[PDB]
Design a protein around this ligand. Sequence first.
Ligand SMILES: O=C(O)C(=O)Nc1sc2c(c1C(=O)O)CCNC2
Ligand SMILES: [Cl-]
Ligand SMILES: [Cl-]
Ligand SMILES: [Cl-]
Ligand SMILES: [Cl-]
Ligand SMILES: [Cl-]
Length: 300
Amino acid sequence: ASMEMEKEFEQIDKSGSWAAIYQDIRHEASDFPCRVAKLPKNKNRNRYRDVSPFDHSRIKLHQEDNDYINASLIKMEEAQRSYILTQGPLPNTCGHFWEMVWEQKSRGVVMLNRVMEKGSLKCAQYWPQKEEKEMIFEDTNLKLTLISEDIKSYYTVRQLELENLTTQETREILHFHYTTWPDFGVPESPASFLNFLFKVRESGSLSPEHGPVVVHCSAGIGRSGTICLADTCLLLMDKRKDPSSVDIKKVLLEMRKFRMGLIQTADQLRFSYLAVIEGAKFIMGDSSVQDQWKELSHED
Ligand SMILES: O=C(O)C(=O)Nc1sc2c(c1C(=O)O)CCNC2
Ligand SMILES: [Cl-]
Ligand SMILES: [Cl-]
Ligand SMILES: [Cl-]
Ligand SMILES: [Cl-]
Ligand SMILES: [Cl-]
C-alpha cells in the first residue's frame, strides 16, 4: 500500500522535477509589505537584507521605544498550532529575543544551526554555556541561567531559567539545539530528524497551553521552515487520522502567507516529503517506529 504523497514523491523523483516544483512554490508564494522591517532605525536589527517579517504577522515587542524584532507568527488555523519563526539573534538583539520569549509565553526554543557555519558567525551566543556565568540583558531587564544540559551525539537539550527582573517571576525554558544540520542543507536522515522533532513534541513545548514555540536557524526560513512544515503536516494527518487529506505543497504555501522564504532549497522540500511520509507510520498507529528512529539516529 501507498499514500498519495508517496505516489507524488515517486513521480517527481522519476521525472527529476524537484527544482521545477520548488520554483513554482516560490513563484506562487505570498508577497506582503515589510515596511517596519525596512525602516532605517531597524537596519541593525536584521541579519539579512533579503529576509524580513511581513508587517501583518510580525511579532511586536511590548516596548514603547522600538517594538521591532525580525520574527513572524506562523498561525496554522486548520492545524491549530502556532510557531514563532525568527532569525538567529544578533549581538544587539539578544535582549529583544528573550523579551519576545517572555512576552509571548513560549516554553521552548528550537535552534537548528550552529553559531559558526561555513566560516561565518550565523548566530550570536545568546544563551549561557556555563551554570556559573549567567547572562543579564540590561536593555530588557531579563536574567538567563543555564540549569542543566543533556548532550547527545547530534543535538543537545538545555534547561534554562529565564527571570523577569522587574517582577522576579521565573520560568523554565527548554532549548532544543540540533547541531548537525548544515546551513542550506538537510538532516542526515529522516530518522534522526524525526527523533529530534519528537523529542521537542514529547517535552510538551508545543502544547496549546503555552505560547508558540520559538524556532530559528540563521535566517529563520530554510531549516526553520523545514521542521515546521513537517510538524504541521504530521499534526494535520493526526487530527484527521487521514494521510490523504494532507497536501504538503498547499501547507507550505499557507505557511508562506506568514513569513517569506520558508524552505530555501528544492532538496529541503524533497526532504520534508521524506520526513512526513516516514512520520506518518507513527501517526497511523505504529509507535515502534519511534524506537527505530532513536536507534538509527545513534544519539549515544
Ligand atoms: O539558516 C537557515 O537555514 C537559512 O535559511 N539561512 C539563510 S536564508 C538566506 C540566507 C541564509 C544564511 O544562513 O546565510 C542568506 C541570505 N539569503 C537568504
Ligand atoms: Cl526610521
Ligand atoms: Cl553552536
Ligand atoms: Cl566553519
Ligand atoms: Cl551574530
Ligand atoms: Cl524562497
